[PDB]
């Protein structure tokens, strides 16, 4: 399981909470777009204040819409940012790791035979707490199942037996396990 820090894209109101970031570095694409939004908003508002014509802010908002619309529509779906094994060469920049979200046919993403169905290479089912998939898992388990209304900490319909298996891919990813037990130690004394 691989974890990354939190970010978000320019929707909602995040463009004010971590304010005063203008230009991109070592940031996710959503964060880079947010930084460009901050640049354009501050630049256009300052220009409007310097020359009080009340239209430079309008042009700033318009170009904000242009940039956001371009980012929203022009995204390329050809991403295979899946981390396993010894090498992750596709990208070194900040990005959201691929997760195999829980599904109706496979509530726990245990990769019983779903791997052989369509994916072939199936991204790992990431942590129980990563992206609120606990609620989705509980909802999917409680699909078509009736409870006796004597357990509000439901264990009566046998939640405990069901769980996510330690590995959720076609292969156990033995290289990562070995690197866990046996660090590379970089350049050692014998070298």
């Amino acid at each position: 399981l691989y974890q990354d820090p939190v970010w978000f894209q320019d929707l909602s109101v995040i463009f004010k909470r971590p304010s005063e970031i203008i230009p991109t570095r070592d940031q996710s694409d959503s964060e880079r777009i947010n930084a460009m939004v901050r640049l354009v908003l501050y630049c256009s508002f300052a220009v409007a204040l310097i020359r009080q014509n009340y239209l430079y802010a309008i042009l700033g908002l318009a170009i904000i819409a242009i940039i956001s619309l371009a980012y929203a529509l022009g995204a390329k779906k050809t991403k295979s940012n899946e981390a396993y094994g010894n090498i992750r060469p596709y990208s070194v920049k900040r990005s959201k790791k691929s997760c195999s979200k829980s599904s109706a046919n496979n509530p726990f993403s245990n990769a019983t035979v779903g791997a052989l169905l369509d994916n072939e290479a199936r991204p790992p089912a990431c942590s129980y707490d990563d992206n609120d998939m606990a609620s989705t898992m509980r909802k999917n388990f409680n699909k078509g199942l009736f409870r006796n209304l004597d357990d509000v900490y439901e264990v009566e319909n046998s939640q405990r037996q069901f769980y996510t298996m330690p590995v959720t891919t076609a292969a156990p990813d033995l290289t990562a396990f070995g690197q866990f037990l046996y660090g590379s130690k970089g350049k050692t004394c014998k070298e």
Binding site: S12, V13, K143, G144
Partner: protein, 95 residues
Amino acid sequence: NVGSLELNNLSTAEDVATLQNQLNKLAEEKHKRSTWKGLTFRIAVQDMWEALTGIPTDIYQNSGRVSLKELLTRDDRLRGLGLIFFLVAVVSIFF
């Protein structure tokens, strides 16, 4: 000859109700068409109600910690900003 199952009707309905499924979903279709027709170009006087719903709720949307732009404006609020037409008409009458 084959069993096809509909999971939900925008709200999960367990396979117990028999005619409630038809009544609920007919009400759903009626509501959808009512919203569509009262939400299209053809409006009589409902602009006032839409504006009065827009302003306080648009402001309150930012009183939550966040509010997605797809919901701050598109939740029956876009024409709710139609009151700006009224105010610009008023000031143009003035100015």
